[PDB]
Every structure is written in structure tokens, then in C-alpha cells.
Design a protein around this ligand. Sequence first.
Ligand SMILES: Nc1ncnc2c1ncn2[C@@H]1O[C@H](COP(=O)(O)OP(=O)(O)NP(=O)(O)O)[C@@H](O)[C@H]1O
Ligand SMILES: [Mg+2]
Lengths: 338, 12
Amino acid sequence: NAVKEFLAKAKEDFLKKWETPSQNTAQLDQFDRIKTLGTGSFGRVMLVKHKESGNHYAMKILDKQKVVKLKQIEHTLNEKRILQAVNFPFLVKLEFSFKDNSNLYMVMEYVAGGEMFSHLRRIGRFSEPHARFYAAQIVLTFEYLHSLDLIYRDLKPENLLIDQQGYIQVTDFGFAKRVKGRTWTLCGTPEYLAPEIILSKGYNKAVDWWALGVLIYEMAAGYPPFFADQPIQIYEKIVSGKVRFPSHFSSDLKDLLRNLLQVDLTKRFGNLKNGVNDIKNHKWFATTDWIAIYQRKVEAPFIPKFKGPGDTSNFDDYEEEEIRVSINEKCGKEFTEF
Amino acid sequence: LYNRTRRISQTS
Ligand SMILES: Nc1ncnc2c1ncn2[C@@H]1O[C@H](COP(=O)(O)OP(=O)(O)NP(=O)(O)O)[C@@H](O)[C@H]1O
Ligand SMILES: [Mg+2]
């Protein structure tokens, strides 16, 4: 009941910012660029430092020409519109955004602990309690997003960052979409694709609960439930309706995962009459204090080593290219709304 | 043998 009123409030806030988006709240020459943290097909994310405040931020840079050239104009306008509109303890905060002649820029709080992917691969697999601590934050986060009619559609350890308190910050709304009923776009990463996406059916927010099942499996095994050397072979396993579990998995974990990795949508946890409460009240989450997780009062199982402001030791090294800004504005028409 | 390399997300 306290949940329904919190989410009613959250919907109002989201909708005001959605309707009247933040635009052009800084400029490139207010920041020093320090290091590339990540890359994508139309740009990069860089650690930057605000010259006046000395605060560090993660700055996502998108090349407008490459965005138009790869026909993802809507996808990027949309990514920024959602990010500027949401507010949740496990979502990375957008602080500033702007554009120039060549690029779009989204300046986020810097999450210094790096990607869950790194920690998970280094240690091999997480204990059930450790995996459960992270899983609860994703459950609350999808509860939040779904209540705004958002589907996230790109869950992966690679895009779940670990903050200085060892909690999750979800990054990258690149594939997120406001959807009232069904949508049809084929997007994600092969190992996280829900079967209804693979089969080109119209799908809903339940693809996110399937993806949660893949994440929990992968966090607890150290590898995902469906993998092969060719995507089509992964897709065959996903749609097959069969999953194998490591014998070290608890019986409660196997049960939860059989219910999330349900090919049949009439049977998938998160998609039934009781919604997210089927997941929250599952035995695997018996020991979980949902309010305490939301209030970030639970002690993290792990805190990344943090060697001072702007430490990037938890991040991989990428080639440092020049950020060329043209003397002439490009694609100005297409990105008016940004 | 699972390939543990970081994964690319794509649309269409
Ligand atoms: N707020 C942030 N704080 C710190 N690092 C970040 C932040 N946002 C993004 N990054 C890093 O940049 C990487 C890529 O960001 P993302 O927005 O996911 O770009 P992408 O083009 O989708 N690439 P990828 O997801 O890596 O295939 C992330 O996985 C992080 O390592
Ligand atoms: Mg990404």
C-alpha cells in the first residue's frame, strides 16, 4: 500500500520531466577530459572533471553524423529523454546534457566501482547472498521502471555499475522505451534475449523479468544459462524451454529461475496476477528486507577498492582518441529536441 | 567453452 502511493508520486514526477525535458545545462569547455571508460558504435564514455566544482562525472559522447548514418536518431533522443526524467536509488543520475556542432553529450554522476561484469568475472561467481543483494535492487528498479510504462530491454552485468557503497547503479537507457501495450523491436544482446523477442512476437515489460532470470543465473553460476559459438544456437536453447542448473545452486534459486526463465508468458513470474510480489515473496528472497534495500541500509557484501576521487582502476583501458568538434554545425535540424 | 568476453547490445 505504501508501495502504490510511492509509485503514484514517482509517475507524476516522471511525467512532468518527460513533458518538459532539461536541455543544454552545460558545455564541453567546463570539463577536463581524463580517460575513456567505455565505447559504443557512435561514441564513448569518458571520465571528466568539472573545472569549477572539481567534481568528476561520466560523460557519454555521441557523434551525431554516426547516429544519423546508423538510423538510431530516435533511440538517442529517447535515451536522453528517459534518463533526464527518472529518479531511483539504483539508477545513475543525469546531471547535465548539451550538444555542439558534431556531438551529443550526457554528463552522469561517475560510478567509480566499475561494471558488475568485471567483479563477477574476476571472482568467477557470486555467493547466493551476494547475487541476492544485487537481484533485489534490480527487482525494485524494474518495479519502478515498469510502473512508468518503461521497458529497459538491455540488462547485462556490463551495464550494472557498483558505487562506493557497493550498491547498483543501472546505466544506459539506449534501448529503453515507453510502451503502453506491446512493442516489436528486436534489440538487446543474444544471451539476454527473451524468447518472445527472438520469435518476433509483440512483447511487453515481461522481457525484463526473463532478463532478470538470466542475470541471477549468471551471477550465481559465473556463466549464463544459454550460450554457444553462434547466436542462432543460443536462440535455439532460449526458445527450447529447457534450462540446466549447477548442482551447487540452492533448490529455492532453481525454483525462482524456473519461474523467471519461463518461455510461456501465462506462467512467467513478474507477468502473473500478483505482478512483482510473486518475485518479492519467493522463498529465495525470504531473508530480504525490501524497504532496507530501497533505503540502502543493508551492508553491501563487497565494496570496490576506491583510491580517491576519479580512480579508474576498476575500469578497462580503451584507446584514447581526440574529441574532434567541427567548425561547422552538423545535423542541427535532426537533434533540435536534444 | 563459454566465451567470457564483454557482450555487445544491438538493435535490429
Ligand atoms: N555513469 C557512469 N559512471 C561510470 N562509468 C560509466 C557510466 N556510464 C557508463 N559508463 C561506462 O561506459 C560503458 C559504456 O556505457 P554505455 O552507455 O553502456 O555505452 P554502450 O555504447 O551501450 N557500450 P557497452 O554497453 O559497453 O557495450 C559502461 O559499461 C561503463 O563501463
Ligand atoms: Mg551499454
